[PDB]
Symmetry: D2
């Protein structure tokens, strides 16, 4: 066992001066005053850095030059390992690989690869986030509340594999309530996204079991006075968690401020990043389109914003500098809040006895100095 | 006289077993019924709720008339008829809208307002000019006549900052509306002196992720007052709920009355309570104290307290008006 | 099956006009528009009443002329049945019988009686609330973090009987952290109360597992500028739930307003009532003192406030009339919020498909018109 | 000149790659560095944060002097020495406390204040009289001299309502403090015209379940401004956090400087950020815009905007003052 001391410690509930985090057997054993440490335990200095739970990114397509998408070779255990290592360098110790697809064979490959990865790599990539196939794709028969035969067989496959599927994003207006309810009752977080839902359709989705929404404001209707749409609905429904992309490009910061005030402890930082995040990519392929990284910006051939390159630490920095959200609350948006949203808070999201030892430390300038995964230092800077 | 035997809402709290003593057009005291002078006349509320009289800062027409539409409508008679119609729905004070781009007609509205004000204190409070900068000699004229022009609505993207600043320093409430302003344009209008916005969400841009527009700007700017139409038709109730949470004590109930609104203030109060989850105390503040502060008349109106104007309304728990009182006189009895 | 229609329906998340609650086999089967009802189902009119989840009172000593306290004959299954029937008349379908004691034999009797009652009466009195023995009784050795032998054997008994103990109220400064942690890990809600805890001692209690506080402001230190005490600590700790007595007598309404604003969705209405609630008692015995009910007020021989006679419906009425809290939010304080606080929200606290059919209806004047328990009408007025 | 190359906080937002142009003791503009006139002199901030100058509305003494303690201390020299000491910690504006029950000494403080004000615009802003009604000719005198008396602290339970009302209508901020007031007594003081409270929690009753007292009343009254001492010593940080949540934009950082406080405004700012979970933008507002509004000087002070007084301070991310600027002159350079 060892202790981290000599920096500001953020537990998820407060900042601590002159305290220590004891780590043993991959766990946080205690958080205590320095003076309540065991005689001659090894102290490892934080050097005035802020110590945090490791960041948790619940929507991530790609990073470190790779994507968990588009081809059979990319939808691999190696891709997930690469993405984990890149995430660490920006303080992110946990993520949901996000596979956006309508293809049955890729989706089954993604489930198999997630299971193989999980047997070898605990408390890292947590489970799959599937965004597909029930999306209302940029655009806009049934009484959509009737289950079609292919949709029944698909929902059955997803429910049988709930042990490696953390989240399914879907458009509520495109799917029967029974499908949302079956997924939720199997333990899968059902998220509203890529949707043209009215406020009324959104609320029917919530009542059927949706508890999350995927990147608020993006790929959702605009908000009008008479038609609040899915986004207005999220903002008005206090029990719905939601991700937001804090790059300054996808969502104007004033809309992030408004969202934070309305959502309280339900607003989660996400990157929704792609391959260029934490890498040196100039162009790549995503859901069948060429995207250029030129710079700051992921743009298609028409110059349209078409991806994120955000890292979690950059997101934390943007929320504090440009959204007037206090650092403790920002850290919660990157740790505790997403942990609760996906039901992993018994193991992650705070620094407290019994929790997994996944931590990151950073300077007051938002430069990562340490990342710790299962108690092992994996980034020293 | 004294008003007794009901729930008295002062603007800051509800009071039981209290009384409102009224004398010479003013509230003299709010006290326990025990402290009441002997032989003072008591007028029972009969279990009704008593409120400051409602103040509607965005009103085009009511009682079958508009201060607008033709030419002869801009008159003292029109303002008198609108006052009387407003009283039936608990509303004691309002700002009539004059929509025009004619300098001469504005000059006429100003002298009519002035004449009304001498004849009829504490009723229609001043002009709401909506026009013409919607999406030079005029500015100084308005400035000169600030004492009878309460509110000017303009689109900030259509005017130089100095026009806004000149209006605001003369004492006029400058309100953003009928505007396609971006967030950046809205924020430039606010820095120039805009303190209000006219019927949030309506005649403004939609809110998108990348472009919050004026509506998003107003939501994000703590110090900007704004009206909202609470008929369930102009604004979905969920958007009202969202706006109340972000605006706090800056959200004001308005009717925008004349495809047109037919809302009255007492209807808006009921709709806010029944469909927006806002407590009755706070809804009453949205119809009284908040608009009063927005337009700078809080010293004489917007609460039931010693020395303020005796403008009151009473209503049953089902939101039916039982009394309206103006300068201490009962003008509606139901 | 039958449907309740023709009144305003409060689900826990919204009010509904022109809708229906379908009840079958003791459960809510659906909440739907009137027009989405089955052809010729029996409709039972609400007659313009407001329909709510039944109220849930997590701190209750006695009501209907009886108390679950003080003597071996009173700590009985019959007492619990009586209290259930009295609670129904004021819209309360669920409670935690609250036994305040330091006596080992009464406490074991209370556990046995709670188990016997529960086998015969589902979804009614939910489990025991024990307030004892680790109380700092009005007044004020160890390093209180060392476990004494009798306290170990007691904590072991409570943990073995967690299946019928819902909550234990204790003073954090009087008990070891290990005891709080063992109770919490056995599933028992540990609540801070009857305590002289400083802010520092309160927070150590929270970190060890306390997630509730018993009747905020009452039998806790006052709040000073330099010493916030247990109450200040509760108000500052967002994840701590707490009960508050809304009779206008125990807590000034301005302090209830301040608490609601600081606690958000964590503030729960409780009665903390005694025998006179819902009865015609003039005097009675409670924790060894004579109390007089004279009227409005439960007073001892010295005229000191010494009990509550509040019912849940009176509490709801007081919060709306005197605290400026909107009716929907008040109803949540009496239903959803206490259900979550004690972990019964999968079965109770809202009107939604699959939930237990425990409901009450009341006029806009706060007069109970219906109470429904396990789908059966038990109060018609 | 222009201030460039740092984070500029206007009071409403933080700006990057902007400049603050200063001319004739005033802020002329806040603009993008691209829009800067050619050959204007630039003074680098060197990555510091630039803020309106801090405004301390509760200050007894600093720089080794009090406007108090003996007799000769009530002088223009004293106010000048306190100004200079305040500038070193980023504070450009303050209200000195005069604690006395001597009419003659108050009369002296008033003429000294008046003389200071002619010699030294936009610095010590006016008097804070604390006394004598702490727990007739005097009232009218104070009223007459409202133009140099900014703030009077009294205990509301010790004065008739009419005394409070007379002070407030003359223009003085009437503040409850050094009081044992119950909630009911506090609320009667507010209705009479009290709009402020002096150092929340300190020299007030404790809060009990049944008796919230003055502190509980202030927390529950949305429209009452109040100061709070953020040294970690006078008020536990948890109580500050609780008070910020309930008071919103009405909570002001004060030092109460002279068992005594040694807090400076820049120390308070750091302590609020580091120990109270309040964002830096909002803390800066607690030290600038909020006190400015409380005492009615928001038209000239409390934000960085066109036409306002050029009173500014800059500090490193570690809260060390690098510049202080008063009427456009750099009075501290570190």
């Amino acid at each position: 066992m060892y202790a981290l001391t000599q920096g500001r410690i953020f537990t998820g509930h407060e900042f601590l001066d002159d305290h220590a985090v004891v780590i043993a057997d991959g766990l946080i054993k205690s958080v205590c005053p320095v003076a309540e440490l065991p005689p001659e335990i090894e102290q490892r200095s934080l050097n005035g850095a802020i110590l945090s739970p490791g960041f948790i990114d619940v929507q991530l397509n790609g990073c470190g030059g790779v994507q968990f998408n588009d081809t059979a070779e990319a939808v691999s255990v190696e891709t997930l390992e690469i993405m984990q290592k890149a995430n660490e360098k920006s303080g992110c110790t946990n993520y949901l690989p996000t596979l956006i697809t309508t293809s049955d064979e890729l989706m089954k490959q993604g489930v198999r690869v997630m299971r193989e990865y999980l047997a070898k790599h605990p408390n890292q990539a947590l489970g799959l986030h599937l965004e597909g196939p029930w999306l209302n794709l940029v655009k806009k028969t049934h009484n959509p509340n009737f289950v079609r035969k292919p949709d029944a067989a698909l929902v059955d496959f997803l429910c049988e594999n709930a042990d490696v599927i953390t989240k399914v994003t879907l458009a509520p207006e495109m799917v029967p309530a029974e499908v949302i309810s079956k997924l939720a009752n199997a333990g899968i977080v059902v998220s509203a996204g890529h949707s043209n839902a009215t406020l009324k359709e959104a609320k029917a989705g919530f009542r059927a079991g949706i508890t999350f929404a995927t990147h608020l404001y993006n790929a959702m209707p605009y908000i009008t006075g008479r038609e609040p749409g899915l986004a207005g609905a999220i903002l008005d429904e206090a029990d719905i968690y939601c991700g937001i992309i804090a790059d300054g490009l996808h969502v104007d910061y004033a809309n992030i401020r408004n969202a934070k005030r309305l959502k309280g402890d339900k607003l989660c930082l996400v990157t929704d990043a792609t391959a260029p995040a934490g890498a040196n990519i100039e162009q790549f392929i995503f859901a069948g389109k060429t995207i250029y990284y030129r710079n700051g910006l992921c743009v298609d051939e028409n110059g349209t914003l078409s991806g994120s390159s955000l890292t979690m630490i950059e997101g934390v920095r943007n929320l504090v500098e440009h959204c007037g959200i206090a650092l403790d609350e920002v850290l919660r948006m990157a740790t505790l809040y997403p942990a609760r949203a996906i039901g992993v808070e018994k193991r992650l999201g705070t620094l407290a006895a019994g929790k997994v030892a996944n931590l990151t430390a950073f300077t007051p300038d938002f430069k990562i100095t340490k990342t710790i995964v299962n108690g092992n230092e994996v980034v020293t800077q």
